[PDB]
Design a protein around this ligand. Sequence first.
Ligand code: HEM
Length: 352
Amino acid sequence: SPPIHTRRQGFDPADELRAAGTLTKISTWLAAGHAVVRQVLGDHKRFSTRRELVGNLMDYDPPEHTRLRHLLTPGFTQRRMRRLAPRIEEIVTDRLDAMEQAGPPADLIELFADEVPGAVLCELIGVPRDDQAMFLQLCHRHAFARYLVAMMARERKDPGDGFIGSIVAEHGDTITDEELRGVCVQLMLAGDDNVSGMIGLGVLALLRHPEQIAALRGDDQSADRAVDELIRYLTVPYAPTPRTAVEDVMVADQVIKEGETVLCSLPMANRDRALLPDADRLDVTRTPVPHVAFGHGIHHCLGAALTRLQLRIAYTALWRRFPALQLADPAQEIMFRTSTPAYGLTSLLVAW
Ligand code: HEM
């Protein structure tokens, strides 16, 4: 009953999804191989992402996409995101405190996984801390757009040095308040469900492979390689933005007609034995590979650096606080999140 590409079995793609060919028609084309997915995503000239929506990079084609992304790129680099580390550490500590105060057992998803990403996003865009609580409540449920108008008005008149402030000070003439508001809305949508899914599933994956936890508190390479492997192995998004063929195009010896849609199975592409001979195995020590969990090509995840830093901080602080982290009952059923654009957990009752 659920769409083929959204079906999972544990941490893995479902058997019916595994049985699918490289490129087949489904009731829409489904690309389920690493090479074919990278071909489709890398072909931005023949495959368009296009179907409010203003500021949504996933709805832009070049040169319009190139222009808008250029203004956003500098505010998403590894070095710029490293500046948020203290605040991420603070947010994570606050949520760990909430778990510790509640005492064992506690729902890691409700108290930790579903709370961290939103708070980090508020810090990213520069929402004042006192307004952050109400900002998230209005955003999660669907005044929200009305608040952002007032936020852009402050920054345009008197620019700070944050995310919005740096854009309006340097390129205020080329970007509008409507575009800035749209960017912020889309950042909330693109960077909440994905990260919350990764926090939940990553914690469980590390519990299921507990010798691999120690990699997180090693040197920079050790920790980053651990996080990237978890990103690869879990591949939380089922698909990127649907790709529409602008013209007739031959992909994998099959003709994709103009107007037809192609869905890329990111989990299948990252389990492709052409990417890794043992792709179904979790190993935090393996050298990073060109996985497509953050996409491929011009639309590749803008929040990739933020995600890597946030997840590293989240996983590391969790076990530093709770070394004896465990499932509340060893035999408890894993509660998978299946109704959102990203795979995750709805609940994870943990003890320590
Ligand atoms: C679990 C972590 C994440 C994963 C797995 C993920 C996945 C992806 C993927 C697959 C794409 C490509 C979409 C496409 O080509 O159609 C993408 C794009 C994008 N992501 Fe993420 N994402 C994550 C976290 C974030 C975060 C935290 C942010 C916010 C800082 C973010 C912001 C964006 C934006 C703005 C785009 C559009 C880029 C463009 O179209 O040029 N993502 N993401």
